[PDB]
Amino acid sequence: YHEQFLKQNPLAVLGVLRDLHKAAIPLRLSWNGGQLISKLLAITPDKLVLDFGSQAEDNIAVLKAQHITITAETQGAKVEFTVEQLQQSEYLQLPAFITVPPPTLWFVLE
């Protein structure tokens, strides 16, 4: 993507994630081997909580992947960032992924 759409400092990155959480649009988690549909359930300055996919084998694959690309788009605007690790946690009595904010984020307003 054009470098125009790059968010680099942690305040700007978190600001986009806050908007993404409130918009509550679907996310796509992609790794070397597959993809699944998720959602940003919760956000703090230190953590992201992501919904499990519907297929258990996808969630297991995503828990051992070493890089995960997260995408979300609506009305011509796309969010894209990569995290290095997801772990399994709990949220509202269901399993969930936990990760941490990326150091950079793409907010592509093409």
Swiss-Prot record:
Disulfide bonds: none annotated. Changing N59W: Significant suppression of the pdeH disruption motility phenotype, less binding to FliG. It comes from the Bacteria. Disruption phenotype: No visible motility phenotype. Disruption of this gene suppresses the reduced motility of a pdeH disruption, thus the double disruption is motile. It is found in: Bacterial flagellum basal body. Belongs to the YcgR family. The N-terminal domain is involved in FliG binding, the C-terminal domain is involved in FliM binding. The PilZ domain is able to bind c-di-GMP, but with a lower affinity (dissociation constant of 1.45 uM) compared to the whole protein (dissociation constant of 0.84 uM). Acts as a flagellar brake, regulating swimming and swarming in a bis-(3'-5') cyclic diguanylic acid (c-di-GMP)-dependent manner. When bound to c-di-GMP it binds to elements of the flagellar motor (MotA and/or FliG and FliM, binding to FliM also occurs in the absence of c-di-GMP), causing the motor to slow down. Thus, increasing levels of c-di-GMP lead to decreased motility. Probably binds 1 c-di-GMP dimer per subunit. Monomer. Interacts with MotA in the flagellar basal bodies. In another study it was not seen to interact with MotA, but instead with FliM and FliG, also in the flagellar basal body. This is Flagellar brake protein YcgR. It comes from Escherichia coli (strain K12). The chain holds residues 4 to 111 of 244 of the full protein.
